[PDB]
Write a protein that binds this ligand. Structure first.
Ligand SMILES: Nc1ncnc2c1ncn2[C@@H]1O[C@H](CSCC[C@H](N)C(=O)O)[C@@H](O)[C@H]1O
Ligand SMILES: [Ca+2]
Ligand code: NA
Length: 373
């Protein structure tokens, strides 16, 4: 039943040109920048666009339920859309009002990214409950740097720590062989939905419940790898979330795990694309110093694209707020002092550098290249 409901959702999105509507609303100079475009802060302007520039047409009513959560009167939905709305309510992907007279948003927000149609966790952009599936601008910038024209239909690709599935689904635009992995129940259920929503199935995209270190140890070899792993370092004693908290003393343990196995897991000449918000000093991120061992030790070419720089002081608030909300802590806990001390003493973080890293084995021009503006 869920698979049929997603097929009917796909049909609706095609019928009313969802991806084109989304692309027009956000425009080409924002579409690939961030998924945080339609949010609680911009929803009223989205509604005004549908009401005034699209004339309030009923064929777009269900679409707005999915995009912003806006209510639509059940009886005002066109007949085909109405039955689909009922199926989405049954699936928990939309809500009905208590009297059943309207349909509105649940916890899933419909966006488009990199040519794919994607349900994401609505709580990241709306409302006040902590989200359970991550997506963000780092997700996008990882994909931005992939040279799509170099992907062959027979290339074997893996998206580790797939989350919503965005990177795996992007790769599936080009290759017929994609593996997508995660260990969280909630993201695994969501990438199943998003795979079907883009007319993929197990014939070209495998979804696997598997720890990233277990995939990295395995004998499967890949031509292309993507991974946006948990990479944030929180002070000792604080609980984070599955998608946020990195391993190791400085949160970069998973990045180390991946990089160390790339000479074995990648076929010769294969490429990995990673992204992380990396601690550093004024010169650059500390992690890049660890990568010279891969240039010399394995002849790799490693390119680091630094696309955002923030002083560590500008992250104290966001980190502290996230920790307070995730664990349900009260407002008299001095989290900010703990974060500041941890940044200074353990991370040596004067700055955070949002960095996409491309790593290629068996490079003809080996070396480390760090790009900063
Ligand atoms: N040890 C592990 N092995 C595999 N997946 C893991 C993992 N630890 C955390 N995860 C998953 O790692 C993901 C990190 S968030 C990145 C999601 C997505 N690739 C994007 O770029 O938007 C989460 O979905 C989380 O569930
Ligand atoms: Ca706009
Ligand atoms: Na991450």
């Amino acid at each position: 039943p869920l698979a049929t409901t997603i097929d009917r959702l796909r049909d609706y999105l095609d019928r009313v040109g969802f991806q084109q509507i989304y692309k027009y609303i956000v425009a080409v100079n924002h579409y690939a920048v961030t998924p945080a475009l339609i949010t609680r802060n911009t929803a009223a302007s989205v509604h005004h666009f549908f009401d005034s520039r699209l004339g309030g047409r009923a064929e777009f009513a269900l679409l707005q339920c999915l995009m912003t959560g806006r209510p639509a009167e059940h009886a005002a939905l066109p007949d085909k859309d109405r039955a689909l709305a009922d199926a989405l309510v049954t699936a928990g992907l939309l809500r009905a009002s208590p009297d059943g007279r309207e349909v509105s948003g649940a916890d899933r927000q419909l966006i488009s990214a990199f040519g794919v149609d994607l349900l994401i966790d609505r709580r990241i952009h709306f409302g006040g409950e902590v989200h359970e599936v991550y997506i963000g601008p780092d997700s996008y910038w990882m994909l931005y740097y992939i040279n799509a024209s170099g992907i062959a239909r027979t290339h074997r690709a893996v998206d580790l720590c797939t989350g919503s599935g965005i990177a795996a689904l992007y790769l599936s635009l080009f290759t017929d062989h994609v593996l997508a992995t995660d260990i969280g129940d909630v993201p695994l259920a969501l990438v199943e939905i998003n795979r079907r929503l883009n007319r993929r199935d197990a014939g070209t995209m495998e979804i696997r419940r598997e720890n990233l270190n277990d995939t990295l140890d395995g004998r499967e070899r890949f031509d292309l790898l993507t991974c946006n792993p948990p990479f944030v370092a929180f002070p000792p004693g604080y609980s984070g979330t599955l998608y946020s908290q990195g391993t190791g003393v400085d949160g970069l343990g998973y990045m180390r795990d991946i990089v160390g196995r790339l000479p074995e897991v990648l076929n010769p000449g294969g490429s990995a694309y990673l992204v992380a918000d990396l601690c550093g000093d004024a010169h650059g991120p500390h992690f890049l110093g660890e990568l010279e061992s891969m240039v010399t030790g394995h002849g790799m070419r490693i390119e680091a694209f630094i696309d955002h720089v923030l002083p560590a002081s500008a992250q104290v608030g966001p980190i502290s707020d996230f920790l307070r909300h995730a664990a349900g802590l009260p407002a008299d806990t001095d989290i900010a002092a703990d974060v500041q001390a941890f940044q200074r003493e353990t991370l040596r973080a004067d700055y955070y550098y949002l960095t996409t890293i491309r790593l290629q084995t068996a490079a003809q021009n080996p070396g480390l290249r760090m790009l900063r503006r």
